[PDB]
Amino acid sequence: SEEAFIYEAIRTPRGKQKNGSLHEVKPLSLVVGLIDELRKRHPDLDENLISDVILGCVSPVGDQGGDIARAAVLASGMPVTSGGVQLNRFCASGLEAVNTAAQKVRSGWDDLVLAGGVESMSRVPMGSDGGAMGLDPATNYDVMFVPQSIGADLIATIEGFSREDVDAYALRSQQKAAEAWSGGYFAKSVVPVRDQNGLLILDHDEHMRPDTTKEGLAKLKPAFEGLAALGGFDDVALQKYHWVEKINHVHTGGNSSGIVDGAALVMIGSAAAGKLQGLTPRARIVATATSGADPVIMLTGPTPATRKVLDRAGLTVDDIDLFELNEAFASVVLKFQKDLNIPDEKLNVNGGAIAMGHPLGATGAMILGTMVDELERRNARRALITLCIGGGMGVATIIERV
Amino acid sequence: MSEEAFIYEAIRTPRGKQKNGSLHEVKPLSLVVGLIDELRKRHPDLDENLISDVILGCVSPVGDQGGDIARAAVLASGMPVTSGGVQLNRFCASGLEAVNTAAQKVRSGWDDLVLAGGVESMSRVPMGSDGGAMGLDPATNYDVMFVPQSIGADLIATIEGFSREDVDAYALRSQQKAAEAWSGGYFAKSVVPVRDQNGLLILDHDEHMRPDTTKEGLAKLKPAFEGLAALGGFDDVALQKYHWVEKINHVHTGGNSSGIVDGAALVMIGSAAAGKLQGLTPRARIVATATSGADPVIMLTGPTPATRKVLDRAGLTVDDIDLFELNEAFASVVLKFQKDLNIPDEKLNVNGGAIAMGHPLGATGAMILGTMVDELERRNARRALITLCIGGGMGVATIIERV
Amino acid sequence: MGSSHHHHHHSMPDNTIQWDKDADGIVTLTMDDPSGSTNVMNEAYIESMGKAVDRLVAEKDSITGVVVASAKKTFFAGGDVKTMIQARPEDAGDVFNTVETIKRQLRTLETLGKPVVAAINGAALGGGLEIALACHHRIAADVKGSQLGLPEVTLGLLPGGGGVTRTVRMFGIQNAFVSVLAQGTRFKPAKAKEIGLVDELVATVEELVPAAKAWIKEELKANPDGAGVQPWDKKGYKMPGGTPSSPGLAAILPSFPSNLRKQLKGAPMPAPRAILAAAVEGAQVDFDTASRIESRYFASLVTGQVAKNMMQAFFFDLQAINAGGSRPEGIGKTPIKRIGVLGAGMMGAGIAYVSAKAGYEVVLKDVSLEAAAKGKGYSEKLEAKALERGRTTQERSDALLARITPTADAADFKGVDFVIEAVFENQELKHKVFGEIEDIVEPNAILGSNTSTLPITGLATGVKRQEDFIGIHFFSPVDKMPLVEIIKGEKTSDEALARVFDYTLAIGKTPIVVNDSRGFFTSRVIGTFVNEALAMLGEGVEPASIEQAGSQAGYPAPPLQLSDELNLELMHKIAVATRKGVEDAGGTYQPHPAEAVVEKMIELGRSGRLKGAGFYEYADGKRSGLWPGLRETFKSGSSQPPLQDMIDRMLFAEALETQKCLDEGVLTSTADANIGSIMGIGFPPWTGGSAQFIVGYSGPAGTGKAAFVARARELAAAYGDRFLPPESLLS
Ligand SMILES: CC(C)(COP(=O)(O)OP(=O)(O)OC[C@H]1O[C@@H](n2cnc3c(N)ncnc32)[C@H](O)[C@@H]1OP(=O)(O)O)[C@@H](O)C(=O)NCCC(=O)NCCS
Ligand SMILES: Nc1ncnc2c1ncn2[C@@H]1O[C@H](COP(=O)(O)OP(=O)(O)O)[C@@H](O)[C@H]1O
């Protein structure tokens, strides 16, 4: 029936957690910034035709509470008929926003929709919103709650991914992200953040460490002594994974996603909706899938979600030019690659969250937009975007260059 | 626009009151898990692996209601790990928005069977607990001309010329129709009594109801003085935009506004194939949905443009609709909507509303949708329209047809 | 370059700070700018403090404490206004950098690991008090004239040298905003201590540095671990009233912007809302981040037009007036012994009050003793309120009231050397009243009239000595209104001007000097304002909208409410006068569309508040809502123009009329036009005055004289030719 097309996909640069450029910037301002960029690119756009704004946000509290999407609509002076809804599907929230938008468009009841996400982790730290799975003992016991870094280490252990293997992926992420930036790949899509006076706040991905070496990564201490892991959680994991004697703690600040601030926005609509606004479609949403796996290991959700979306679209791994999986932890990406036999040169080709960071609610939309660009640059046909999710969920999307 | 979306089940908990409420001791997660177990009871042979998502509305997704309560519900109820779980917030309409989004996911053809609905324990997690920019950020608060909900409702009354007796007359009428619905057994199959870990009854009725309400009792009430309204400025802010209005008439009280309550609702939404493969009987079809809006200052004018838009897309007119259901946030909102579209009384909120039974923010949308599914079946009528006024001046409306 | 205390890091100003290190390791930094009588935050201060702070860090192993002092009569006068007014939007980067540099210096001072004590010898205002707030302890000399506060909001600015950030950490958001920031109030040293802005007081300036050094000595002995550490720089810090994420404050926080909007009445003054935004945003983050946010909001205001308007009016223009710009040149002083006031109505009563409060003997004469007594009762009621509020002692209040003597006898004007007449607007009555008195008063007495419209030249002919006859125009209510409009008639001497000018300063008011003309400056201009409002009512515009337009324009009171306070019968005969003037010269009068409305209300017996009925209904001495009959009378709602059009009609009418007054030589300076319009007839402070409005207009058309002219012409095309700009604004 109706097809869903991507007309614009933009993002902010990503600000680091410690002494970050974006720390002084409210998350709402990040979104408004991007709305003004879309308006700049299409000054003659009839905004009355935009029926919804859908924003992923993992910690909808404080600066990020109170339906931040509606706040963006009003604060940006967008029409009062333009909607505004917040959603939270953990790490995949940004992509889930794009997917929901695509599905609304396909349903025929929405014409032109803005989708994306925002996470300002330096102002609203993860876990700020509370939650029963963690903070209610009865259900914490039930689901066998475990911080995701432990699941990441468990995967490394089971799959036989060594500390060197994991660090080698991290190095390659840094290298590929630096090459993308200096190749001018991100020029069109990364929108510098500016203050109320027009002064520059941030224009690049601060978290990047392009001069990373294998020796430096080997010096880092496991995150098993970091913040999230207090005590008990190894034994909980191993109670389920009872044939595994000992968890090898391989993940560190150097080979896990960076904690960062940022936002992303995507414009999605029907062919008809684009035609009368004079927008050129950049890509088409081919299919979407929600699936999952064991919530204890937590981070193996990408595999069945990917299998499901390929099946829906009637496609196989061989039909996909580019695979983009969020780099929450190196082992998650190596597990995915192993499972589906993904060739290296097809996987996260412009680097990922280890280099550039993972602003929870925005990431899905950011890496989605990253694929729209690479497809256009490479003149390739298909990309598959997927993310691992807390609670053992998986979401995947297939896009096609138009 | 391909796959048609059908409602197979629509249930809800009773609504517990805010002060000395029966549900105060019940975690919002338990409210949801309870309703999942009811569905299990009603379809013991349902293959849950076919359920691809759970979509829950929640206006204050913090503390007990944070961390994606939908996924908490999926995991805590022992549903398959493949069954999704997503929380959403579109303020008052969140519950209907879940259902609408669920229906839209089915229509896309990428989801087959979805649980949708919502939850709010306002006694445990009060409105506003989540914060937010347009309220708590001065630069935004100034630029959006933020004003509390009640002030908008009073302004409506002022502009349209609804008196204190007018709004209280509607309040009385809601209580009467709620009591009648309960007496007639209209809610018997759909209100699921809440029980403890031991099966002991916690609550089985909508305890906010005041069935013996009188004209005289309502007249004796004081205009709204709790929360944001009691603080200064908001009248003046409102009149700065609505400058032709000299004075706001404060007609709204606790007896003609919706009640603060605890509750949850669940709707089972799927494709025709999905229902057939599982031995499920369709009860209604989602005909169309619409999202629109109006001025954020007056705020509660959103249902009119949303209703007009959904009527239009479904190719229908006011005459084609057998039942209109609009959330009773404030009396004047209902009267305004009725006045705009010339809605006949006998068609409007026929089983009573939130003034009588309460408005558990995130769940209300799904609750009143389920209310219309049951009444369409009971009256043997064909079409219902469900709509809500929303904070920030938004509107959402849905049309269902009995199958 | 990075984290530097200096403006420049590539390849010079004078030194303003004296360095003295004691045998105990205490450093005294004495501020003494050799280029003015006052210490300001200019390029020389910045470099001088840069050097000193570098030296503080370099010599830290031998420094035990610091004392910040001044060698001037005042401590520190704040930001350099001469530089700030010049800042354009493209200068936002430089302004941001300047203010960040200033604060980097203060932050080093504050986080030095040693106590720093501000020795406040005199006025510490704005940037001045911000230096002191960067210190760990504040001692002020309880001296005459000494003020402390952050008045930058009064100039359309904010405390961008840490003022916001620091007062918020000190008092919390709500108290900092309400008590200090939002209004920018000046405080006497005792009051400044009361609210925690200053820590302790000394009797004389000489005690300051010794007491400061004594404090450091004790602090190091009594509190070694926490010496030189601000409360907010400690691990256990808790902000008074809570942070924005704290439940108690979160519950009331949404009402702060609404309460301010209510207070401002929707006027376009950006500074107070910027201060609030900076306060809350600052409170959400660490000190340094909070401080940088403060700079962005500051740069926002400084490069904006309103700050320029307000800086011009409330610094430059006010200073110009206070230095005697409109006062005649080589004229000496003549101290006033006894004031005589003719008339005990609201005006005369008020004039008698403000004169008595200033310290003068007042003889208050009316036609009967009963009348004169009720006139004095006006002052008694003001003192009753002042005693209840605790703003005066009983003994001083008794003396104030004892200076006023009510009489009905003209012989009681014996020994009176200063006459202020405040009787009914009527020439022959005023002639008669002065007649009865001119021979009883001293031979050198000033003969002053409080006429609103009638030319002074005409009134003067009723006296023998016309050299001493002058217009002394007060504004209701006299106890609150700060302007005196002094009017030179043809025969008025320069000495008379000076003498009244002096009197005006002596009673604590602001003088403008105007050349004789019917309606003068103030009455003529306020007229055009209320006439525009009445015209809209006649055109069919909702009264509610008219009042809202007036308030949202920024006027202290809405125009129909004001039209009731001025009598409608006075407006009628003002129009009758102007009509007679034209018709006698054989011309044809063009009535203002408002005149038909005035006449209509007179005919309905609704001539204003004094008669109990105007555009408003009055019950029991209280105004109570607009008269419902207004809508049927004028077909209200049948004309629905843009609210901004209504605002602009009112502001533009006055701005245009002011230019005419400048053209005709009624006014002799823009300074007088601006301050006179602001203090006399409540023209909105954000505009910086009726004259400044012309050069500093901002809207859809843009900014400046050109953008004003465009909008003026746009209004003329829509509403009438009275909005066409006079030739003196064109090319
Ligand atoms: C500090 C003050 C009370 C001293 O009053 P005073 O003893 O009568 O001295 P004056 O007012 O005659 O000032 C003397 C000189 O200092 C200058 N000056 C005072 N404050 C200044 C400031 N903030 N910026 C620039 N120059 C200033 C005056 O322009 C004048 O210069 P000039 O005589 O060379 O033309 C008075 O100057 C004042 O109120 N200044 C403004 C303070 C303020 O509100 N600024 C901070 C908020 S931005
Ligand atoms: N009785 C009324 N009903 C609806 N709108 C009204 C009424 N009276 C006045 N208005 C409104 O007044 C407005 C004109 O002023 P406005 O547009 O607010 O000024 P601005 O253009 O400066 O914002 C119109 O948009 C109109 O809607």
From TrEMBL, chain C:
One Pfam family from the record: 3HCDH
Gene Ontology BP, a term: fatty acid beta-oxidation
Binding residue positions for CoA 1: T38, A77, G79, D80, V81, K82, R186, Q319
Pathway: Lipid metabolism; fatty acid beta-oxidation; Lipid metabolism; butanoate metabolism
Residue numbers binding CoA 3: A77, G79, K82, R186
UniProt: NAD(+) 2 binding residues: A344, M347, D366, V423, K430, N450
GO annotations of cellular component type: cytosol; peptidoglycan-based cell wall; plasma membrane
Binding site for CoA 2: A77, G79, D80, V81, K82, G127, E152, R186, Q319
Binding site for NAD(+) 1: A344, M346, M347, D366, V423, E425, K430, N450, S452
SUPFAM superfamilies in UniProt: 6-phosphogluconate dehydrogenase C-terminal domain-like, ClpP/crotonase, NAD(P)-binding Rossmann-fold domains
Keywords: Fatty acid metabolism, Lipid degradation, Lipid metabolism, Lyase, Multifunctional enzyme, NAD, Nucleotide-binding, Oxidoreductase
GO molecular function annotation: enoyl-CoA hydratase activity; long-chain (3S)-3-hydroxyacyl-CoA dehydrogenase (NAD+) activity; NAD+ binding
InterPro entries referenced in this protein's UniProt entry, alphabetically: 3-OHacyl-CoA_DH_NAD-bd, 3HC_DH_C, 6-PGluconate_DH-like_C_sf, ClpP/crotonase-like_dom_sf, Enoyl-CoA_hydra/iso, FA_oxidation_alpha_subunit, NAD(P)-bd_dom_sf
Nucleotide-binding keyword on record: yes
PANTHER family given in the database record: TRIFUNCTIONAL ENZYME SUBUNIT ALPHA, TRIFUNCTIONAL ENZYME SUBUNIT ALPHA, MITOCHONDRIAL
Family: Belongs to the 3-hydroxyacyl-CoA dehydrogenase family.
Protein name, entry field: Probable fatty oxidation protein FadB
UniProt source species: Mycobacterium tuberculosis (strain ATCC 25618 / H37Rv)
